[PDB]
Amino acid sequence: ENEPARFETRSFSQLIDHARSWKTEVRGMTTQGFTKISLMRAEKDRLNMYAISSVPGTNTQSIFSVTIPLELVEKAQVADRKFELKLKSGSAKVCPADSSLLAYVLNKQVYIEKNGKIIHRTSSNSKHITNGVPSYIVQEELERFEGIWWSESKTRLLYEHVNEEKVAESQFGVNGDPPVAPMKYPRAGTKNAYSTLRMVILENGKAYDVPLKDEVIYKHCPFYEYITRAGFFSDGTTVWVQVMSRDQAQCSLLLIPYTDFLLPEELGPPRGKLRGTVQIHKARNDYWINTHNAIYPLKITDEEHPMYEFIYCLEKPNGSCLALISAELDQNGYCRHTEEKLLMAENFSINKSMGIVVDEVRELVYYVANESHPTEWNICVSHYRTGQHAQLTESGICFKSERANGKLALDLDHGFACYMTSVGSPAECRFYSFRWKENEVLPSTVYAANITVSGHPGQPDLHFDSPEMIEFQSKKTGLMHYAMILRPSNFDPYKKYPVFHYVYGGPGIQIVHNDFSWIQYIRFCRLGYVVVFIDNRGSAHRGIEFERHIHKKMGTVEVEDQVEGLQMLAERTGGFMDMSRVVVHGWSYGGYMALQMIAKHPNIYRAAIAGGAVSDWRLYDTAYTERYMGYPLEEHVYGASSITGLVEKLPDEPNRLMLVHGLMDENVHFAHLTHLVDECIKKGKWHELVIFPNERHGVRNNDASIYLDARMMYFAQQAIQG
Amino acid sequence: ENEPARFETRSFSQLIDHARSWKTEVRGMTTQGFTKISLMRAEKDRLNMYAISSVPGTNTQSIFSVTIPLELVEKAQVADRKFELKLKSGSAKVCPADSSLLAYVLNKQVYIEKNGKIIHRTSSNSKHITNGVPSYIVQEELERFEGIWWSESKTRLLYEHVNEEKVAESQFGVNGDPPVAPMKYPRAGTKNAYSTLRMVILENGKAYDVPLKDEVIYKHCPFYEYITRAGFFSDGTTVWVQVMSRDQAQCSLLLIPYTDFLLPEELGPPRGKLRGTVQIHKARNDYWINTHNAIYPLKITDEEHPMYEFIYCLEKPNGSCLALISAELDQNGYCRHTEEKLLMAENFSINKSMGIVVDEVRELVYYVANESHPTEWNICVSHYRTGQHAQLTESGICFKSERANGKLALDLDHGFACYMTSVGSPAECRFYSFRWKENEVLPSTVYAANITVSGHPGQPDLHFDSPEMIEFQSKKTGLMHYAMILRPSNFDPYKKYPVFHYVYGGPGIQIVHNDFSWIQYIRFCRLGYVVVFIDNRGSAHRGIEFERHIHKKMGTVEVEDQVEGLQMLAERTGGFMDMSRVVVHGWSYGGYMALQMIAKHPNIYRAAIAGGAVSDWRLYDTAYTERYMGYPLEEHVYGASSITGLVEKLPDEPNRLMLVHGLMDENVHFAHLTHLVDECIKKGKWHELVIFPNERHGVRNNDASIYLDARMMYFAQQAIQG
């Protein structure tokens, strides 16, 4: 038994001041950092770190650098005092083969420039025909942010062609105002943009613009819908692409020679060579194959026997593994065999949003993976010829990526610089120095230095109740789950507090994580709330067996995991969580589930706040919806997972349901809200509605953000205080 | 002193059932009626009434008729038992001059048909160029619903030309959905559609399509913006138009001869004749001139001296009067003089939304006017040569018009059929029979019969507390005002009840009126509310002196009249109205004022419900906004009357402000709401928002209507019950 904690109520105007003061304070918990890290060897004996940061006193961006004192860093082979390095100030690529050549995308067209002069450009007769920029769905869901690639050895460029002409329109704006250009947005069951690759060949300043032959991909890939990845093979002689089926259940990697481009005539065991375009890997799942950036062509050892070898990723029931994938062709160019050599244990996943760094002098590949723990990223190295494996960072400390399709700032001989974070500590940038041994394959590392940007304030001394990181087993499935509790500012172990249950629950995202992202929720803990995060089946970085349970069953499985996880935490917490005062909140997919949970479990959740909620999957985009819901679109599958069928089950009482939505939200459209609101009207269900006419998917304006917080918080008080 | 009445609270679900049951009952207070009334003399000795009604058992429309037993009616010269007549079943015009000719507007183009065959049509190369249909602003604000006219004597047709190409666009739809054709909507300070008239001349089946010479109007009317009225003059020889300035402060009537049309060359005191187009009347106002349908050309008595004479309306400080307007031209065609002969006392207004019926055999004009009372319409007759005047309907009973630009179903010799209504009684259609006397000019009438449609249920026996119709004088202006109170279902004179104050307050509309339109508010009185209606300065049918006070001052004057009127009623009611529990509601302009009143008088109004509110006049249309706000648009005038400047004054506490709006509202655009919501977000002001994604200006869907009522009522309880 526990005593109900007093819950302190307050005025809306006081919630505004709370949210406003808080934003001033939350920014004081961090320092100016840098948005990119890279290392270069300017000289054989010097290593220089570069990063992008603001100029002190302003928000203007510039490139900063520091010299790494390698003679001194090399001596930090023990856990000695760490050195500080101070960094100082002072869409386009330069071809590695030629420093005078640049290529970039300007106004969604590809340009090639020499010494400041444009020598070649692509053109289109329509805004819906694009070059150098990935198709919207590809950039948005399949996470490719570039359409431009250079060969390393030679002055040749590869780029993407996009055709949006049959893509369905979406209007944005405010009713009664003048029309603006429509957005092109694919929907489930609708046609997507058409894609193909092209090349520009530069011969002594003479550009040629040559398309790929149209059936080169299709002929080998009968199910082809998307190009998910592309780039040059070694020595710049060949182009590979990774392609997928519409539902992303099938994936193939195919290697395309120069002769399979539509060149002008002026430019053109018994194992064989790359006779023509061929698949060098194929994979199929029962549910889906996820995209990743762990693709890297290896240099061929034998030109007579140009064994096809690359670093790739294979999905497994458990984890997502790096593998050395290799293949043999017949004399006639088709594959006779693939090997699928795993470089790691299946029990953990790689970070698919990260690229990899591959050595050739030594056969070492460096990558980010969940080696130590499901909630933590580590930097690891493996030898791709042996399968020998080691972890280069400490367990309990998480590697942080600042961007999708991120990179490690790794110097193959000396070490690397990166951000590391943990649940009890803000991200910090540190340098790990390599140590090499005789008669050994893998390096070891030592933490030798920190990097800070000069001219800025140092790190604040922060004081808080560290989040309780909890692992527990499901009582229904036997699966391990992770959850986290953020403690209220003034905590009494023998009192119970109102529950704020934050959910996302959708695929591709992990909420419970070993980082410092939980800081933003201190604002609720200062109001006497317990904030609980739980992951679930369908959640990212566990493996397909864990994710697959939501296949054609969205809103049916992950909602139960959230409910059971909450109840188990209530037992483990010693009963300081009050189950009679529970409010559930989420955004995007989380808004969808906040609706699902109150509709299905009105006796657990007193109220729900659903922001950016997806009411109908048929109104959402193609690549996301169909990999989970299947294809061809099935009316009864999509109907079962919609909110439409749950409107009847929504609470009859007022102040139990709140809907929050942007008017300009291009991700989850306002149409989803209007559908939900219209159903509520028909069914006689009460709802509170908050709209932000000038906001997108999230709320970015500082005052709009304050307002939103004040209303979520005010609403929550009324929901519980009864 | 008075005892607070218990206020009975209830659940949202109970408010839904109340509103739902009510709609079933409110329809039971009425019967099937008919949407048009007309009389014809099929034979010299027979008068036949025709009307449009549904076929019993269904909603299918058809034409019904009854023969009037004239001899029986003629003998009903006393207040005898009245007779019932039972009516039985069984965009285009037929030319009065020729029964074989028809003309109509189809798909917004003008067609002329003979014996079922099209002989002539207009055409356009764009959807924005229209013929036969009044321009949107003209149809919407200046109340003209037709662009097609026939000559009475001859086979000639007149029609309107509309050019919308420079009119600003307005997008409607749901964000994320495909674009639909933009609406053309003028805004204050923006360009309107261009208009001109054209003719089709039919000579033995040979059509000619002839434009008006472009400067015919402009040359005589330098301020010309709109054509507000048009039609043929007597004998079909000439065309007159009524035109206005952009701010509608100036108005002219000009008479245009056949020779001022471009024509094919084959067709084209010392007082004179219609030498050419000339103004025959001009009027100017310091504020504005209102439009009306009281224009009628009179037959000229002397062809040698074709005195220009017509029935017209002159605005006065008090009232809107019929006048016989006449003019003389010089020999050279320009006016030397106008007479302005008033046919009525200035103390009352004509019904400007009604047309008039004019006799020539006797110089009698029949019209609807506020002869007996400011809240009541009467049918009146006057002799246009003498000014002799009489009232043909009983005082205390109001004439009802079923439509804008309505007509009297008047037979000049026998009498008329019309709907009459009163505050204590549902509209009924009755026949008034004329009585003529020797050596007398005006007819008298007797109420002889009622007309009902056969096959339908008779009138219900209704029981209610009749509305208290109140007149009182302002303590600040000395002006007379009218107000009405609807009593709560179970009324205790010594108890006080919560106040529901309904407002419109805008120009062109009268809320307090002697009719049965108050029935819809019984639904609030059954919940224990007192419903109070008050008119104000700026309100319709009093005269320009009464209306002009809101000139360039919208939201500044009419709000005070509503506040003072409420307080005076509280005194006159004996204190049964509770001033500590006041909720104000209105729609459209009323929504605007509901915001104005709480922002300005938070100590009187506990809460406001603003539906369809206009937050910014610059977002509203040209013809309406500029006649009140002036032209050229002034930033500080429009700023002063906007809600933007009042957002700061809106209540800080929650549940005090509610905003209701349609998403597809083409009258008051959603942009008005998004502007208001955005300001609230910036200022930190709480609001409740209800949106109807599939509704227009009002809410028409039966379930959407039930839902809206339930939320307005639920909200009101929470606002007062504290």
Author numbering:
A (entry chain B), B (entry chain A): 34 to 123, 257 to 434, 465 to 918
Reported in the publication:
To examine the substrate specificity of a second DPP-IV family exopeptidase, we selected C. elegans DPF-3, a DPP8/9-orthologue that promotes male fertility through N-terminal processing of two large RNA-binding proteins, WAGO-1 and WAGO-3. The overall structure follows the conserved dipeptidyl peptidase (DPP) fold that is characterized by two domains, a C-terminal hydrolase with α/β fold, and an N-terminal β-propeller domain encompassing eight blades as observed in other DPPIVs. We validate the specificity of the motifs through applying qPISA to another member of the DPP-IV family, C. elegans DPF-3, an orthologue of human DPP8/9, which reveals a related but distinct cleavage motif. Through a DPF-3 structure that we solve using cryogenic electron microscopy (cryo-EM), we can rationalize differences in the subsite interactions between the two exopeptidases.
To relate the observed differences in substrate specificities of DPF-3 and DPP4 to structure, we determined the structure of DPF-3 to an effective resolution of 2.6 Å by single particle cryogenic Electron Microscopy (cryo-EM). The map was interpretable for residues 37–123, 259–431, and 470–916. DPF-3 superposes with the apo structures of its orthologues DPP8 and DPP9 with r.m.s.d. A comparison of the DPF-3 apo structure with DPP4 reveals an S1 subsite that is nearly identical for both enzymes, with all amino acids being conserved. Instead, the divergent enzymatic footprints appear best explained by differences in the S2 and S1’ subsites. Unlike DPP4, DPF-3 contains an acidic residue (E309) but lacks a bulged loop inserting a hydrophobic/aromatic residue (F357 in DPP4) into the S2 subsite, which alters its geometry and chemical environment substantially. E309, which structurally aligns with a serine in DPP4 (S209), is adjacent to the double glutamate motif that is required to position the terminal NH3+ group. Another significant difference from DPP4 is the presence of an isoleucine (I705) in the S1’ subsite of DPF-3 that is oriented towards the P1’ substrate position. In DPP4, the corresponding side chain is a serine (S552), which is retracted from the substrate along with a segment of the loop. This difference is consistent with DPF-3’s enhanced preference for several hydrophobic and all aromatic amino acids at P1’, because the isoleucine may facilitate hydrophobic packing of these side chains to contribute to substrate binding or positioning.
